[PDB]
Amino acid sequence: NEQLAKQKGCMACHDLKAGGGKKVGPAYADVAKKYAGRKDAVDYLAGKIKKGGSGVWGSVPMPPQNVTDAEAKQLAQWILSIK
Amino acid sequence: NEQLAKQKGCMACHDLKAGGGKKVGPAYADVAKKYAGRKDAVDYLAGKIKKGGSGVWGSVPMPPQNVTDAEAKQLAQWILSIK
Ligand code: HEC
Numbered sequence: 131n132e133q134l135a136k137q138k139g140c141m142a143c144h145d146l147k148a149g150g151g152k153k154v155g156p157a158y159a160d161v162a163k164k165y166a167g168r169k170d171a172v173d174y175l176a177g178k179i180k181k182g183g184s185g186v187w188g189s190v191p192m193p194p195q196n197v198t199d200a201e202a203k204q205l206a207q208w209i210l211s212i213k
Numbered sequence: 214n215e216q217l218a219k220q221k222g223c224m225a226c227h228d229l230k231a232g233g234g235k236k237v238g239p240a241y242a243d244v245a246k247k248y249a250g251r252k253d254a255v256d257y258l259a260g261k262i263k264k265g266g267s268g269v270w271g272s273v274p275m276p277p278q279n280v281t282d283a284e285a286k287q288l289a290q291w292i293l294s295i296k
């Protein structure tokens with residue numbers, strides 16, 4: 131399974147899918163660093179995940195995503211936790 | 214959480230951290246595409262995982278991995294499942 135592969139060190143040499151390093155959106159660790167000082171980061175990011183947005187990291191927009199309000203908040207919190 | 218983000222499609226457009234794209238081995242989805250539906254795929258891949266391999270995807274070899282035969286079979290089956 132995926133967790134076993136992580137534990138065994140496999141992911142030092144392998145990604146799940148191709149295209150690493152060339153994606154259209156920002157790295158989550160950079161999102162986490164940016165908003166570390168921001169008290170309302172969770173709701174700000176949840177809004178962007180659900181409703182989409184542009185201009186914060188580049189000119190290409192993130193389209194609105196198929197997530198509930200609760201999921202958007204959960205994803206925001208997880209991203210903020212990334213170190 | 215991490216699994217939720219993967220399941221929702223977020224990772225098509227985002228990496229977890231900066232510096233992606235330099236892994237030395239093939240992406241698992243590409244391994245899965247190659248060997249999908251071959252009658253000996255599980256045994257073949259389990260053997261490469263455990264014993265290592267060279268020259269199938271490039272010049273850089275995979276060393277033997279610290280896995281049991283059962284774990285190698287588990288890992289092979291998981292990799293073959295990656296869409
Ligand atoms: C942790 C136990 C794993 C698992 C499950 C896999 N790998 Fe590797 N791998 C690496 C390289 C350079 C290759 C290509 C070798 C070649 O050109 O022949 C591979 C290949 C694979 C495969 C496909 C094998 C095939 O013949 O098609 C598979 C299923 C696979 N790996 C699984 C490099 C590395 C590492 C670099 C030091 C390490 C660590 C791992 N791999 C670990 C694992």
Ligand code: HEC
Nearest residue numbers: 154155178183184185186187188190191192195205223226
């Ligand atoms: C799956 C539900 C997700 C989640 C959890 C996130 N994204 Fe994206 N995203 C994309 C692009 C181009 C941007 C930059 C937009 C801009 O310049 O403003 C983003 C941005 C984000 C953020 C940061 C938002 C901010 O204002 O700081 C976050 C937290 C985030 N995303 C999470 C592109 C895409 C996609 C391309 C089609 C898709 C799919 C996703 N993102 C999916 C998700």
